[PDB]
C-alpha cells in the first residue's frame, strides 16, 4: 500500500 | 496533488 | 484500490 | 484541502 | 473507501 | 489507512 | 499541513 | 505508522 | 512532499 | 516540522 | 516499510 | 527532509 502529497 | 492505493 | 486528486 | 479514508 | 476536497 | 492535507 | 496513517 | 508535518 | 509505503 | 513513529 | 517528506 | 525503515 501507498500514500503521498505534494 | 495526492494518491492513495491499497 | 486507488483514490487521488490534483 | 482533502481528507480521505480507505 | 471515502474522499473530502473543498 | 487515512490523509489529511491543509 | 498533513496528517496520515496505515 | 503515522506521520503529522506542518 | 510526503511519502508512505507498506 | 515533523513527527513520525511505526 | 518506509516514511520520508521534504 | 526526513526518512524512517523498517
Chains 1, 2, 3, 4, 5, 6, 7, 8, 9, 10, 11, 12 share one sequence.
Not at 500500500?1 to 505534494?6: A, T, V
Request: aromatic share 16%; glycine share 34%.
Amino acid at each position: 500500500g501507498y500514500m503521498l502529497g505534494s
